[model samples]
Target: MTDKTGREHLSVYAVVVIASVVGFCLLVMLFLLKLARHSKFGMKG
Candidate 1:
Protein backbone atom coordinates (compact mmCIF):
# COMPACT_ATOMS: atom_id res chain seq x y z
CA MET A 1 0.00 0.00 0.00
CA THR A 2 2.77 2.42 0.85
CA ASP A 3 4.60 1.88 -2.40
CA LYS A 4 1.46 2.22 -4.44
CA THR A 5 0.52 5.46 -2.74
CA GLY A 6 3.99 6.89 -3.21
CA ARG A 7 4.00 6.20 -6.93
CA GLU A 8 0.53 7.56 -7.38
CA HIS A 9 1.35 10.76 -5.53
CA LEU A 10 4.50 11.31 -7.55
CA SER A 11 2.68 10.72 -10.82
CA VAL A 12 -0.04 13.16 -9.87
CA TYR A 13 2.43 15.86 -8.92
CA ALA A 14 4.37 15.47 -12.15
CA VAL A 15 1.23 15.61 -14.25
CA VAL A 16 0.03 18.74 -12.46
CA VAL A 17 3.32 20.55 -12.97
CA ILE A 18 3.53 19.64 -16.65
CA ALA A 19 -0.06 20.60 -17.29
CA SER A 20 0.33 23.95 -15.56
CA VAL A 21 3.41 24.84 -17.54
CA VAL A 22 1.81 23.89 -20.84
CA GLY A 23 -1.34 25.78 -19.99
CA PHE A 24 0.63 28.91 -19.10
CA CYS A 25 2.60 28.81 -22.34
CA LEU A 26 -0.59 28.38 -24.31
CA LEU A 27 -2.15 31.40 -22.64
CA VAL A 28 0.91 33.54 -23.30
CA MET A 29 0.91 32.56 -26.96
CA LEU A 30 -2.74 33.47 -27.26
CA PHE A 31 -2.19 36.87 -25.69
CA LEU A 32 0.77 37.57 -27.94
CA LEU A 33 -1.23 36.62 -30.99
CA LYS A 34 -3.99 38.95 -29.96
CA LEU A 35 -1.55 41.79 -29.51
CA ALA A 36 0.10 41.12 -32.83
CA ARG A 37 -3.21 41.12 -34.60
CA HIS A 38 -3.95 44.59 -33.30
CA SER A 39 -0.48 46.01 -34.03
CA LYS A 40 0.24 47.68 -37.37
CA PHE A 41 3.57 45.90 -37.65
CA GLY A 42 1.85 42.58 -38.17
CA MET A 43 1.03 40.85 -41.46
CA LYS A 44 0.34 43.00 -44.51
CA GLY A 45 -1.71 40.36 -46.30
Candidate 2:
Protein backbone atom coordinates (compact mmCIF):
# COMPACT_ATOMS: atom_id res chain seq x y z
CA MET A 1 0.00 0.00 0.00
CA THR A 2 2.90 2.33 0.73
CA ASP A 3 5.04 1.25 -2.17
CA LYS A 4 5.84 4.82 -3.13
CA THR A 5 7.69 5.36 0.12
CA GLY A 6 9.18 1.86 0.17
CA ARG A 7 10.57 1.86 -3.36
CA GLU A 8 14.07 2.58 -2.13
CA HIS A 9 14.05 -0.60 -0.05
CA LEU A 10 13.48 -2.79 -3.08
CA SER A 11 17.13 -2.84 -3.99
CA VAL A 12 18.10 -3.77 -0.45
CA TYR A 13 15.66 -6.65 -0.48
CA ALA A 14 16.94 -7.76 -3.86
CA VAL A 15 20.53 -7.71 -2.63
CA VAL A 16 19.66 -9.77 0.46
CA VAL A 17 17.72 -12.33 -1.57
CA ILE A 18 20.52 -12.59 -4.12
CA ALA A 19 23.06 -13.10 -1.37
CA SER A 20 20.92 -15.82 0.24
CA VAL A 21 20.49 -17.65 -3.07
CA VAL A 22 24.20 -17.46 -3.79
CA GLY A 23 25.03 -18.80 -0.36
CA PHE A 24 22.55 -21.66 -0.70
CA CYS A 25 23.95 -22.59 -4.11
CA LEU A 26 27.49 -22.57 -2.81
CA LEU A 27 26.57 -24.85 0.09
CA VAL A 28 24.67 -27.22 -2.18
CA MET A 29 27.62 -27.46 -4.53
CA LEU A 30 29.91 -28.20 -1.65
CA PHE A 31 27.59 -30.95 -0.46
CA LEU A 32 27.45 -32.50 -3.92
CA LEU A 33 31.21 -32.46 -4.18
CA LYS A 34 31.50 -34.20 -0.84
CA LEU A 35 28.94 -36.80 -1.88
CA ALA A 36 30.81 -37.48 -5.10
CA ARG A 37 34.04 -37.90 -3.19
CA HIS A 38 32.41 -40.54 -0.98
CA SER A 39 30.87 -42.45 -3.89
CA LYS A 40 32.85 -45.45 -5.16
CA PHE A 41 32.96 -47.53 -8.32
CA GLY A 42 32.08 -51.20 -8.86
CA MET A 43 35.05 -52.70 -7.05
CA LYS A 44 38.10 -50.46 -7.22
CA GLY A 45 36.37 -47.78 -5.22
Candidate 3:
Protein backbone atom coordinates (compact mmCIF):
# COMPACT_ATOMS: atom_id res chain seq x y z
CA MET A 1 0.00 0.00 0.00
CA THR A 2 2.39 2.71 0.93
CA ASP A 3 5.42 1.43 -1.06
CA LYS A 4 5.28 0.38 -4.70
CA THR A 5 8.68 -1.42 -5.00
CA GLY A 6 7.53 -4.32 -2.78
CA ARG A 7 11.00 -4.67 -1.19
CA GLU A 8 9.42 -4.99 2.25
CA HIS A 9 7.57 -8.19 1.34
CA LEU A 10 10.66 -10.36 0.81
CA SER A 11 14.43 -9.98 1.24
CA VAL A 12 17.10 -10.76 -1.40
CA TYR A 13 19.07 -13.00 0.99
CA ALA A 14 16.07 -15.34 1.40
CA VAL A 15 15.73 -15.88 -2.35
CA VAL A 16 19.46 -16.61 -2.81
CA VAL A 17 19.53 -19.22 -0.02
CA ILE A 18 16.47 -21.02 -1.41
CA ALA A 19 17.91 -21.10 -4.94
CA SER A 20 21.29 -22.39 -3.72
CA VAL A 21 19.70 -25.29 -1.84
CA VAL A 22 17.72 -26.46 -4.90
CA GLY A 23 20.74 -26.14 -7.22
CA PHE A 24 23.02 -28.21 -4.93
CA CYS A 25 20.47 -31.03 -4.68
CA LEU A 26 20.12 -31.22 -8.48
CA LEU A 27 23.89 -31.35 -8.93
CA VAL A 28 24.33 -34.26 -6.51
CA MET A 29 21.56 -36.30 -8.19
CA LEU A 30 23.05 -35.83 -11.67
CA PHE A 31 26.54 -36.86 -10.52
CA LEU A 32 25.26 -40.12 -9.05
CA LEU A 33 23.36 -41.02 -12.24
CA LYS A 34 26.46 -40.40 -14.37
CA LEU A 35 28.56 -42.65 -12.15
CA ALA A 36 26.05 -45.52 -12.46
CA ARG A 37 25.88 -45.21 -16.26
CA HIS A 38 29.66 -45.50 -16.59
CA SER A 39 29.81 -48.81 -14.65
CA LYS A 40 30.02 -52.16 -16.51
CA PHE A 41 26.79 -54.13 -17.06
CA GLY A 42 27.83 -57.81 -17.19
CA MET A 43 31.11 -57.49 -15.24
CA LYS A 44 31.56 -57.15 -11.46
CA GLY A 45 30.79 -53.56 -10.47
Candidate 4:
Protein backbone atom coordinates (compact mmCIF):
# COMPACT_ATOMS: atom_id res chain seq x y z
CA MET A 1 0.00 0.00 0.00
CA THR A 2 2.81 2.41 0.82
CA ASP A 3 4.60 1.70 -2.42
CA LYS A 4 1.43 2.29 -4.39
CA THR A 5 0.87 5.60 -2.71
CA GLY A 6 4.45 6.65 -3.38
CA ARG A 7 4.09 5.93 -7.08
CA GLU A 8 0.91 7.97 -7.27
CA HIS A 9 2.51 10.88 -5.48
CA LEU A 10 5.51 10.79 -7.79
CA SER A 11 3.28 10.94 -10.87
CA VAL A 12 1.42 13.94 -9.44
CA TYR A 13 4.68 15.73 -8.75
CA ALA A 14 5.83 15.14 -12.32
CA VAL A 15 2.58 16.51 -13.73
CA VAL A 16 2.72 19.59 -11.54
CA VAL A 17 6.33 20.32 -12.51
CA ILE A 18 5.55 19.97 -16.22
CA ALA A 19 2.46 22.18 -16.00
CA SER A 20 4.28 24.90 -14.08
CA VAL A 21 7.14 24.96 -16.57
CA VAL A 22 4.76 25.27 -19.51
CA GLY A 23 2.76 28.03 -17.83
CA PHE A 24 5.90 29.97 -17.04
CA CYS A 25 7.10 29.77 -20.62
CA LEU A 26 3.75 30.99 -21.88
CA LEU A 27 3.84 33.96 -19.53
CA VAL A 28 7.33 34.88 -20.60
CA MET A 29 6.37 34.74 -24.26
CA LEU A 30 3.36 36.97 -23.68
CA PHE A 31 5.45 39.48 -21.76
CA LEU A 32 8.06 39.56 -24.51
CA LEU A 33 5.41 40.10 -27.18
CA LYS A 34 3.92 42.96 -25.19
CA LEU A 35 7.30 44.62 -24.89
CA ALA A 36 7.99 44.18 -28.56
CA ARG A 37 4.69 45.80 -29.49
CA HIS A 38 5.40 48.72 -27.19
CA SER A 39 8.80 49.26 -28.74
CA LYS A 40 7.37 49.16 -32.24
CA PHE A 41 4.78 51.75 -31.32
CA GLY A 42 7.39 53.98 -29.75
CA MET A 43 9.48 53.81 -32.90
CA LYS A 44 6.50 54.74 -35.05
CA GLY A 45 5.61 57.63 -32.80
Candidate 5:
Protein backbone atom coordinates (compact mmCIF):
# COMPACT_ATOMS: atom_id res chain seq x y z
CA MET A 1 0.00 0.00 0.00
CA THR A 2 1.15 3.52 -0.75
CA ASP A 3 1.76 5.98 2.06
CA LYS A 4 -1.45 7.89 2.60
CA THR A 5 0.32 10.95 3.95
CA GLY A 6 2.48 11.32 0.86
CA ARG A 7 0.15 10.08 -1.85
CA GLU A 8 -3.39 10.64 -0.65
CA HIS A 9 -3.34 14.36 0.09
CA LEU A 10 -1.05 16.39 -2.15
CA SER A 11 -3.32 18.78 -4.04
CA VAL A 12 -3.86 20.98 -1.01
CA TYR A 13 -0.18 21.27 -0.31
CA ALA A 14 0.61 21.83 -3.98
CA VAL A 15 -1.87 24.66 -4.26
CA VAL A 16 -0.53 26.33 -1.17
CA VAL A 17 3.05 26.09 -2.37
CA ILE A 18 2.19 27.40 -5.84
CA ALA A 19 0.26 30.35 -4.43
CA SER A 20 3.06 31.22 -2.07
CA VAL A 21 5.60 31.21 -4.88
CA VAL A 22 3.41 33.39 -7.09
CA GLY A 23 2.81 35.85 -4.30
CA PHE A 24 6.51 36.04 -3.57
CA CYS A 25 7.38 36.67 -7.22
CA LEU A 26 4.84 39.47 -7.47
CA LEU A 27 6.11 41.12 -4.33
CA VAL A 28 9.69 40.90 -5.52
CA MET A 29 8.84 42.38 -8.90
CA LEU A 30 6.95 45.24 -7.32
CA PHE A 31 9.77 45.96 -4.91
CA LEU A 32 12.41 45.87 -7.62
CA LEU A 33 10.36 48.10 -9.91
CA LYS A 34 9.80 50.60 -7.15
CA LEU A 35 13.48 50.73 -6.32
CA ALA A 36 14.43 51.06 -9.96
CA ARG A 37 12.09 53.99 -10.34
CA HIS A 38 13.34 55.78 -7.21
CA SER A 39 16.95 54.67 -6.91
CA LYS A 40 19.69 57.27 -6.82
CA PHE A 41 22.65 55.01 -7.24
CA GLY A 42 24.37 57.22 -9.74
CA MET A 43 23.24 60.82 -9.51
CA LYS A 44 26.31 63.00 -10.00
CA GLY A 45 25.67 66.32 -11.68
Candidate 6:
Protein backbone atom coordinates (compact mmCIF):
# COMPACT_ATOMS: atom_id res chain seq x y z
CA MET A 1 0.00 0.00 0.00
CA THR A 2 1.18 3.50 -0.81
CA ASP A 3 1.25 6.21 1.85
CA LYS A 4 1.68 9.98 1.78
CA THR A 5 3.76 9.98 4.97
CA GLY A 6 6.78 8.72 3.07
CA ARG A 7 6.64 11.64 0.68
CA GLU A 8 6.20 14.09 3.53
CA HIS A 9 9.19 12.66 5.38
CA LEU A 10 11.33 12.84 2.26
CA SER A 11 10.56 16.49 1.62
CA VAL A 12 11.33 17.42 5.22
CA TYR A 13 14.58 15.46 5.17
CA ALA A 14 15.67 17.05 1.92
CA VAL A 15 14.95 20.55 3.19
CA VAL A 16 16.86 19.99 6.43
CA VAL A 17 19.84 18.53 4.64
CA ILE A 18 19.99 21.35 2.11
CA ALA A 19 19.64 24.00 4.83
CA SER A 20 22.39 22.45 6.95
CA VAL A 21 24.76 22.32 4.02
CA VAL A 22 24.11 25.92 3.09
CA GLY A 23 24.49 27.07 6.69
CA PHE A 24 27.76 25.21 7.13
CA CYS A 25 29.17 26.69 3.93
CA LEU A 26 28.27 30.20 5.00
CA LEU A 27 29.70 29.66 8.49
CA VAL A 28 32.97 28.45 7.04
CA MET A 29 33.11 31.39 4.64
CA LEU A 30 32.53 33.96 7.37
CA PHE A 31 35.08 32.21 9.55
CA LEU A 32 37.66 32.33 6.81
CA LEU A 33 37.01 36.00 6.29
CA LYS A 34 37.51 36.67 9.97
CA LEU A 35 40.72 34.66 10.02
CA ALA A 36 42.04 36.56 7.04
CA ARG A 37 41.34 39.90 8.67
CA HIS A 38 42.98 38.73 11.86
CA SER A 39 46.09 37.81 9.92
CA LYS A 40 45.92 40.84 7.63
CA PHE A 41 46.73 38.61 4.68
CA GLY A 42 45.16 40.82 2.02
CA MET A 43 45.75 44.41 3.00
CA LYS A 44 47.24 47.40 1.20
CA GLY A 45 50.23 49.13 2.72
Best prediction by lDDT: 4
State each candidate's clash count: 0, 0, 0, 0, 0, 0
> Arrange candidates by lDDT, highest first: which order?
4, 6, 1, 5, 2, 3
Can you write out model 4's per-residue Cα lDDT over 1-45, one digit (the tens) per residue? 355567779999899999999999999999999898988865785
1-45 in candidate 3: lDDT tens per residue?
354556754676579889999999999999899888767576776
* CA displacement after TM-score superposition, residue 39 of candidate 3 (Å): 1.2
- Residue pairs in clash, model 3: none
All candidates' TM-scores? 0.62, 0.68, 0.54, 0.69, 0.66, 0.66
Q: Clashing residue pairs, candidate 5?
A: none
Ranking 1 against 2 by lDDT, winner: 1
Which residue pairs in candidate 2 have backbone atoms (N, alpha carbon, C) closer than 3 angstroms, thus clashing? none
- lDDT tens digits by residue: candidate 2, 1-45: 555547669988899999999999999999999878667553454
Candidate 3 TM-score over all chains jointly: 0.54
Report the Cα lDDT for candidate 6: 0.88
Q: How many backbone clashes does candidate 4 have?
A: 0
What C-alpha lDDT does candidate 4 achieve relative to the native structure? 0.89
Per-residue accuracy of model 5 over 1-45 as CA lDDT, tens digit each: 565676536987788999999999999999999989676676734
* Candidate 4 residue-wise lDDT at 9: 94
For residue 35, model 4's alpha carbon misses the true position, in angstroms, by 0.2
User: At residue 7, what lDDT does model 3 achieve?
Assistant: 77
Count of clashes in candidate 2: 0
lDDT of 6 by residue, 1-45 (tens): 655668788998899999999999999999999887887766755
**lDDT of all the models against the reference?**
0.87, 0.83, 0.79, 0.89, 0.83, 0.88
Deviation (Å) of 11 in candidate 3: 3.1
- The reply for model 1, stretches above 4 Å from the true place, is 1-5, 42-45
Between candidates 2 and 4, name the one with more favorable TM-score. 4
